[PDB]
């Protein structure tokens, strides 16, 4: 349905971010939280693509992944988007994201050859939930400020993946179409 490219986290990180979501909870704001299996770093959103574009993209990603070496990154810090006053999305940041950034820029340049728009201004993050509305602004800002530079854990950037999300009556389901290991 809608395809995108991502980097998955590991179980240790997933567990720590889920506990952080619980700690935020729903008392200071109504938040639709990301399900545990869907916590990941998005490198590029593709939209609806044909099977032929998908095949072509899988070939390109295979070659891109083999140019980068597996490396360990730390998930650190809570960020808000678009801005502290006005909170729409709560994210976790990545420490040492430069190689991820480099990959996402290389992806955007190659897929540009296939007609996909370069979106630029990439920021490596893991979305933790989307704020429907804030109930207690002060309380929410207080809880987010305590988390601002929090060390949530580390994981090895192992592969880039091509995934897709499909809306079904029971909500969106995500699938992994292909996975491309970075160089050891």
Swiss-Prot record:
Residues annotated as catalytic: 40, 125
Pfam families in alphabetical order: LigT_PEase
EC number, as in UniProt: 3.1.4.58
Domain of life: Archaea
InterPro entries named among the record's database cross-references: Cyclic_Pdiesterase, Phosphoesterase_HXTX, RNA_CPDase
Residue interval(s) of motif HXTX 1: 40-43
Keywords per UniProt: Hydrolase
Chain positions of motif HXTX 2: 125-128
UniProt-recorded Gene Ontology molecular function terms: 2',3'-cyclic-nucleotide 3'-phosphodiesterase activity; RNA 2',3'-cyclic 3'-phosphodiesterase activity
Catalysed conversion reaction: a 3'-end 2',3'-cyclophospho-ribonucleotide-RNA + H2O = a 3'-end 2'-phospho-ribonucleotide-RNA + H(+)
Similarity comment: family membership: Belongs to the 2H phosphoesterase superfamily. ThpR family.
General function of this protein: Hydrolyzes RNA 2',3'-cyclic phosphodiester to an RNA 2'-phosphomonoester.
Protein name (database record): RNA 2',3'-cyclic phosphodiesterase
Organism for this UniProt entry: Pyrococcus horikoshii (strain ATCC 700860 / DSM 12428 / JCM 9974 / NBRC 100139 / OT-3)
